[PDB]
């Protein structure tokens, strides 16, 4: 299963690591987040050395604004806090683009 952070701090400390951290900003008021939610569930099962997280943008609004997130969900894999890839428009399959190329 994929973890949901509760603070920008949790996200920041994850993405600042020398590891692949892909967090996805979510919301309870979206349909696309629903469909990729079981998909990324699987994909997050297939990441042994990389980590999948998905946040609730209604709680993580400020952090979302930091990363100028204007879509739901938004998939950003970070590396050493310098990022590694960016996908932004409900990407269950396109996550694999960033996720497989970087992670």
UniProtKB/Swiss-Prot annotation:
Gene3D superfamilies: Glutaredoxin. The active site is at 30 (nucleophile), 33 (nucleophile). It is found in: Nucleus; Cytoplasm; Golgi apparatus membrane; Mitochondrion intermembrane space. One of its GO terms (cellular component) is fungal-type vacuole. Residues 2-103 form the Thioredoxin domain. The record marks 24 as: Deprotonates C-terminal active site Cys. It comes from the Eukaryota. GO terms for biological process: cell redox homeostasis; deoxyribonucleotide biosynthetic process; endoplasmic reticulum to Golgi vesicle-mediated transport; protein transport; retrograde vesicle-mediated transport, Golgi to endoplasmic reticulum; vacuole fusion, non-autophagic; vacuole inheritance. Disulfide bonds join 30-33. The keyword Metal-binding does not apply. The record marks 31-32 as: Contributes to redox potential value. GO terms for molecular function: disulfide oxidoreductase activity; protein-disulfide reductase activity. Coiled coil: none annotated. InterPro entries: Thioredoxin, Thioredoxin-like_sf, Thioredoxin_CS, Thioredoxin_domain. There is a cross-link at residues 54, 66, 96 (Glycyl lysine isopeptide (Lys-Gly) (interchain with G-Cter in ubiquitin)). Reversible disulfide bond formation between Cys-30 and Cys-33, reverted by thioredoxin reductase TRR1 using NADPH as hydrogen donor. It is a peripheral membrane protein. Keywords: Cytoplasm, Deoxyribonucleotide synthesis, Disulfide bond, Electron transport, Golgi apparatus, Isopeptide bond, Membrane, Mitochondrion, Nucleus, Protein transport, Redox-active center, Transport, Ubl conjugation. Its main location: nucleus. It holds the Pfam family Thioredoxin. PANTHER family: THIOREDOXIN-LIKE PROTEIN 1. Belongs to the thioredoxin family. Present with 8579 molecules/cell in log phase SD medium. Participates as a hydrogen donor in redox reactions through the reversible oxidation of its active center dithiol to a disulfide, accompanied by the transfer of 2 electrons and 2 protons. It is involved in many cellular processes, including deoxyribonucleotide synthesis, repair of oxidatively damaged proteins, protein folding, sulfur metabolism, and redox homeostasis. Thioredoxin-dependent enzymes include phosphoadenosine-phosphosulfate reductase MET16, alkyl-hydroperoxide reductase DOT5, thioredoxin peroxidases TSA1 and TSA2, alkyl hydroperoxide reductase AHP1, and peroxiredoxin HYR1. Monomer. Part of the heterodimeric LMA1 complex together with the proteinase inhibitor PBI2. Most of the thioredoxin of yeast is in this complex rather than the well-studied monomer. LMA1 binds to the ATPase SEC18. This is Thioredoxin-1. It comes from Saccharomyces cerevisiae (strain ATCC 204508 / S288c) (Baker's yeast). The lineage of its organism: Eukaryota, Fungi, Dikarya, Ascomycota, Saccharomycotina.
